A paper describes a structure:
Here, we have linked one of the most common protein–protein interaction events, homodimerisation, to an essential trace metal, copper, through engineering green fluorescent protein. By incorporating a cysteine at residue 148 together with a mutation that stabilises the dimer interface, we engineered sfGFP to switch to a highly fluorescent “on” dimeric state. Structures of the monomeric and dimeric GFP-diS2 suggest that charge switching is through peptide bond flipping and the formation of a buried organised water network around the chromophore that spans the interface region.
The two dimers have a defined, symmetrical interface comprising the same residues from each monomer unit covering 910 Å2 (as defined by PISA44). The introduction of the V206F mutation plays an important role in promoting the dimer formation as it makes interactions with 6 residues in the neighbouring monomer, including a pi–cation interaction with H77. The main changes are increased solvation of the chromophore and a plane flip in the position of the C148–N149 peptide bond. The water molecule close to the CRO (W1) observed in mGFP-diS2 is still present in the dimer but 4 additional water molecules are now observed. Together with W1, the W2 and W3 water molecules form a H-bond network to the CRO with these waters being in the same plane as the CRO. W4 and W5 are above the plane of the CRO and occupy the space available due to rearrangement of the C148–N149 peptide bond; they form a H-bond network with S147. In the broader picture of the dimer, waters W1, W2 and W3 form a long-range polar network that spans the dimer interface incorporating Y200 from the second protomer. Crucially, these water molecules are also largely buried at the dimer interface thus restricting their exchange with bulk solvent.
Residue numbers in the entry:
A (entry chain A), B (entry chain A): 0 to 64, 68 to 233
The structure:
Amino acid sequence: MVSKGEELFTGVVPILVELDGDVNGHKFSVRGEGEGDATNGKLTLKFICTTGKLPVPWPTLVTTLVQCFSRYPDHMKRHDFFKSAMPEGYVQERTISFKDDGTYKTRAEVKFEGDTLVNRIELKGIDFKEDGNILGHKLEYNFNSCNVYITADKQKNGIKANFKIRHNVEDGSVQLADHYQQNTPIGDGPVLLPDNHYLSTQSFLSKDPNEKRDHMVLLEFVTAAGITHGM
Amino acid sequence: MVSKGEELFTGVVPILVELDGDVNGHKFSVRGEGEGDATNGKLTLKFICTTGKLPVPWPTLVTTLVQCFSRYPDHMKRHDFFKSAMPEGYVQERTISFKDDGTYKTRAEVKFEGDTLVNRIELKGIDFKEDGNILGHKLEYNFNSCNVYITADKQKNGIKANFKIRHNVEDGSVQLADHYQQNTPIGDGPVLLPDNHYLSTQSFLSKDPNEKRDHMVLLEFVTAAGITHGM
């Protein structure tokens, strides 16, 4: 039984991402466009800094810049909160604590505006070191993680996640980014509260050789796993 | 340019797996049947121990029981050795060293026999402890890993991999299984030697409630990543 939220994702869906950021008083905007193919768990986006030089490394923004495009295998569809909240969508909040450096706090609404899945984000960054790995642009241009665990919000409709991102630093050290995440449905419609499970994400960060603006080309594959009940 | 080996995988392909095993002199056979969908990197197999009780835990056999069904994204197809060797196929050899316990040595041929992709394996296990985690059946019925790195065989046509599998033990400890892998093409036809990359595998192990024989139902999703050149 393909749920109504699920039905919105059965084809290729256009994506718009808008981020307005302030890190230590550096104002920037990022705009991304592309498409999501939830059936294959495939994301293809190109992000532009529309205000000039991005004052943080692109890799620090990957997690902030649409978990509704996760490939949930058939036997796990009952645990897909992200599509069940659509089209009205969900609020996604994070604290991202960079070890020995500053903090990002993000608030986003992920929802349909007509035929497009929109992720509209506000980001505030404080306590960054002027010559640390983030404001100093010392992070390698890549992105790796090994499973983000998703859990039901146990006081209310929604999900939570906490996970650690390891950013390679150019000197061969590692910059830790501890993520705390809470998602709440925007509407009052029924949603699916999941059992514990995880999302596995592979990421490819490249450049468009003809693009002069500061930018990130991003390809992702995402698959849910960690529940075997009901197959 | 869809290579001829690639073309053999564009649909759903039937799979046959045959394993003849000897662990500490316990003779067993495993037979598996199902299908591979390389376009989605999806494997669905059911394995039977045709000789009675499997004398090792099913999870210890998952890696031995067809990397040609990996989803290689478009920009990485030139690095897919496993399909390039088809239909004549490849020899896949492993040593699997169980920490504080015995060793498996495996030799398999992965090739097409008519319309079916066949994995035919010989397994020899020695130096197992009669009451260790393997012959004692103390391993949880599940399977997790975080990336297997694939490299070109640098003296000859083929690939190598070494990776560590962590099997959960029922007391809450961990049984390490260190895998060393070498694959060689069976034919003399051109093959693709890859740049360094990895395979990401999600695994679901269940039971058929109507199956009385010792068995494992296995669903897998596999995606290649770790190269961004040429997108």
